Amino acid sequence: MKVRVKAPCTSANLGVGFDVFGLCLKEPYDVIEVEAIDDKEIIIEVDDKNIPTDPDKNVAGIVAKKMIDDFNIGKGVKITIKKGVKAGSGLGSSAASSAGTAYAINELFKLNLDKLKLVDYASYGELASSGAKHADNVAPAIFGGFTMVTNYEPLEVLHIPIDFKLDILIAIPNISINTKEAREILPKAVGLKDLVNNVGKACGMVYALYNKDKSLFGRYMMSDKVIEPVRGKLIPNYFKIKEEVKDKVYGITISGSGPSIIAFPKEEFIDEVENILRDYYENTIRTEVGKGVEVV
Amino acid sequence: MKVRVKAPCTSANLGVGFDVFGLCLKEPYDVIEVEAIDDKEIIIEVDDKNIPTDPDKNVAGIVAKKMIDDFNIGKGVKITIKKGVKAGSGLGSSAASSAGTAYAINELFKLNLDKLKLVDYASYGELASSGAKHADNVAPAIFGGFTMVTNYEPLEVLHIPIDFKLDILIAIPNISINTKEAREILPKAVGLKDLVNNVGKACGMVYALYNKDKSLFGRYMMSDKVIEPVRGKLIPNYFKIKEEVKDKVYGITISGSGPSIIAFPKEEFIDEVENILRDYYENTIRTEVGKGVEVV
Numbered sequence: 001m002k003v004r005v006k007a008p009c010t011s012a013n014l015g016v017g018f019d020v021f022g023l024c025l026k027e028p029y030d031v032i033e034v035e036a037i038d039d040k041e042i043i044i045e046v047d048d049k050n051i052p053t054d055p056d057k058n059v060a061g062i063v064a065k066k067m068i069d070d071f072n073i074g075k076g077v078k079i080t081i082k083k084g085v086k087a088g089s090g091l092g093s094s095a096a097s098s099a100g101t102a103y104a105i106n107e108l109f110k111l112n113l114d115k116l117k118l119v120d121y122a123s124y125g126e127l128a129s130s131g132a133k134h135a136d137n138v139a140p141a142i143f144g145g146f147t148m149v150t151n152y153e154p155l156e157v158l159h160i161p162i163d164f165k166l167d168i169l170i171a172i173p174n175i176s177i178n179t180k181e182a183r184e185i186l187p188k189a190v191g192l193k194d195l196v197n198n199v200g201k202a203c204g205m206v207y208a209l210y211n212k213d214k215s216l217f218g219r220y221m222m223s224d225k226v227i228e229p230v231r232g233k234l235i236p237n238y239f240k241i242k243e244e245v246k247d248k249v250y251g252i253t254i255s256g257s258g259p260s261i262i263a264f265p266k267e268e269f270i271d272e273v274e275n276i277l278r279d280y281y282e283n284t285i286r287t288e289v290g291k292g293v294e295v296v
Numbered sequence: 297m298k299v300r301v302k303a304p305c306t307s308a309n310l311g312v313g314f315d316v317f318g319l320c321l322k323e324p325y326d327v328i329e330v331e332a333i334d335d336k337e338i339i340i341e342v343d344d345k346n347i348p349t350d351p352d353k354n355v356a357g358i359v360a361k362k363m364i365d366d367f368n369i370g371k372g373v374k375i376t377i378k379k380g381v382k383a384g385s386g387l388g389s390s391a392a393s394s395a396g397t398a399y400a401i402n403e404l405f406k407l408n409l410d411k412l413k414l415v416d417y418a419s420y421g422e423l424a425s426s427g428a429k430h431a432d433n434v435a436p437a438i439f440g441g442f443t444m445v446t447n448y449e450p451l452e453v454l455h456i457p458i459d460f461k462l463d464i465l466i467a468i469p470n471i472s473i474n475t476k477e478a479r480e481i482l483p484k485a486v487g488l489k490d491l492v493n494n495v496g497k498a499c500g501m502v503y504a505l506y507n508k509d510k511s512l513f514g515r516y517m518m519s520d521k522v523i524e525p526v527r528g529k530l531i532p533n534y535f536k537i538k539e540e541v542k543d544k545v546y547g548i549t550i551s552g553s554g555p556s557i558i559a560f561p562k563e564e565f566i567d568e569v570e571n572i573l574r575d576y577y578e579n580t581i582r583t584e585v586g587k588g589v590e591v592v
């Protein structure tokens with residue numbers, strides 16, 4: 001009959017973890033309901049008028065069709081989506097719809113697929129919306145916590161639960177940034193030295209999570225000199241904001257391909273950091289690490 | 297009066313951890329004795345006739361002088377070295393002398409320096425022998441276990457003890473490879489895709505150690521396509537050996553800049569893997585993860 005889920009926004013890259021790291025947020029999230037229908041068609045309703053309802057264009061339809069065909073399911077589905085945040089915000093909006101749909105289809109048709117497989121299916125949605133089957137936003141959307149996409153073909157995802165408090169502040173600019181473009185402006189090659197820096201800093205972030213060291217995690221997160229300095233120039237006041245909250249956060253960086261900004265405020269300055277972000281971007285939210293798609 | 301230590305060989309890079317990762321071996325090692333002397337000169341005796349006795353050229357003399365001057369120590373030292381393995385073997389031979397000396401000087405003159413500082417001093421020895429103040433061999437020589445050099449200026453080293461059994465086989469070709477040259481032949485730039493691969497795989501190796509997963513650790517270790525395929529062409533029969541021990545090891549790769557080869561054999565095939573390595577290289581040894589410089 002029907003399955004309804006909340007599918008969370010996620011923050012990919014986290015600086016030196018470009019195309020690998022992902023952190024699941026508790027909010028915002030999409031509320032997605034999938035209902036099996038007799039007609040073998042996929043019908044989509046979405047509250048954001050800028051998101052297509054064509055099932056071959058909305059990632060929810062792309063993922064549902066792939067799963068329905070792969071399991072010879074003989075039904076269609078009506079998918080209703082209420083968006084947590086607009087597309088192109090750097091908060092994994094489309095990944096929320098892809099992952100929420102994969103999860104919902106799995107439940108609705110009792111496919112008993114494991115999390116890795118759900119991420120793999122959701123990534124077919126990311127293929128379409130970004131032109132690349134990247135799984136770094138759909139992985140945390142499904143697994144919750146912190147994930148690392150460590151291989152493709154075949155997809156491998158390593159998950160590290162965050163079992164300690166990690167306050168998150170997200171500033172969401174009203175402008176949007178197209179991920180494909182955000183990737184084209186990136187260097188085609190990086191110096192051996194950046195390879196070494198990013199590998200060391202990203203490994204240090206993994207060590208930091210196992211040691212529950214927010215300070216180390218946040219500081220290493222801000223050491224990327226390859227991607228973040230580039231995308232950061234697309235975001236109004238981004239560098240000014242970083243300087244203004246400098247000693248009041250464990251770290252702050254671009255969420256995904258931007259323009260949203262993700263900050264991990266120190267407990268002592270959370271209200272103040274939130275007020276600073278809000279002065280620049282009215283749409284600022286306080287959240288924490290989420291647990292992934294779940295029924296609602 | 298005198299301090300004598302065993303300073304271990306170490307295996308740097310471990311594939312995707314190039315210039316970051318280091319693993320301390322239990323053997324071979326240098327046996328180094330440092331004796332305070334009244335004359336303010338540094339005298340060096342070494343059993344390998346191809347290693348200089350000039351204190352400005354032997355890394356033990358370079359490190360001792362730096363420490364003696366930095367602490368206004370008013371004595372000279374006589375340093376006697378019995379080498380575990382020749383220089384240019386890819387087993388951190390010079391780092392063993394640098395680290396063993398830093399450690400010995402610290403003990404002899406009761407400097408009470410922490411491990412990080414000892415690595416920093418030892419790295420002055422690596423500056424001279426490789427033209428680069430790399431700390432990826434001296435870090436594990438001092439800390440023991442697995443280390444990651446995650447920053448320079450200032451040096452930062454993260455240590456992960458290996459508290460599970462990890463058998464190591466090392467094949468030591470009679471030829472030598474000069475590290476400076478081994479680095480010049482490396483690509484000056486790598487594609488974004490290799491950046492992503494190596495960051496993900498190296499982070500996966502860190503996750504693997506915390507999860508005591510030798511299989512994952514060894515498999516990711518063999519995924520570098522940037523440095524290992526290049527240096528591997530300098531080592532006779534290296535690729536043939538990799539294929540021949542393919543399913544009998546968790547992983548096998550080049551130790552440091554080569555030509556020595558480091559393999560982590562599966563428990564079931566250890567003798568067989570050792571015999572295979574020995575058929576190609578008579579000088580093959582079986583060892584395990586070491587604990588770093590210690591008094592002997």
Ligand SMILES: Nc1ncnc2c1ncn2[C@@H]1O[C@H](COP(=O)(O)OP(=O)(O)NP(=O)(O)O)[C@@H](O)[C@H]1O
Pocket residue numbers: 050051052057058059060081086087088089090091092093094095096097098129130137177178179180255256257258
């Ligand atoms: N259900 C959906 N939800 C959001 N976006 C969708 C959806 N279906 C299709 N799209 C399209 O996919 C693109 C954006 O997906 P979105 O997740 O916002 O990615 P982004 O622009 O790459 N930024 P990031 O949040 O970093 O992944 C736009 O072309 C959307 O119209």
Ligand SMILES: Nc1ncnc2c1ncn2[C@@H]1O[C@H](COP(=O)(O)OP(=O)(O)NP(=O)(O)O)[C@@H](O)[C@H]1O
Pocket residue numbers: 346347348353354355356377382383384385386387388389390391392393394425426433473474475476551552553554
């Ligand atoms: N006490 C010493 N022990 C070993 N080598 C020394 C020593 N003092 C000076 N050297 C010189 O330093 C160079 C090699 O140092 P070594 O650690 O074997 O480095 P490598 O050639 O870079 N390979 P790797 O094992 O990967 O670090 C040669 O030029 C040596 O003569």
Ligand SMILES: N[C@@H](CCO)C(=O)O
Pocket residue numbers: 012013018019020090092134136137179182183255256257
């Ligand atoms: N890793 C992708 C994530 C997009 O959310 C990028 O930054 O291009």
Ligand SMILES: N[C@@H](CCO)C(=O)O
Pocket residue numbers: 308309314315316386388430432433475478479551552553
């Ligand atoms: N990371 C260095 C180590 C040398 O032991 C290299 O491979 O050039």
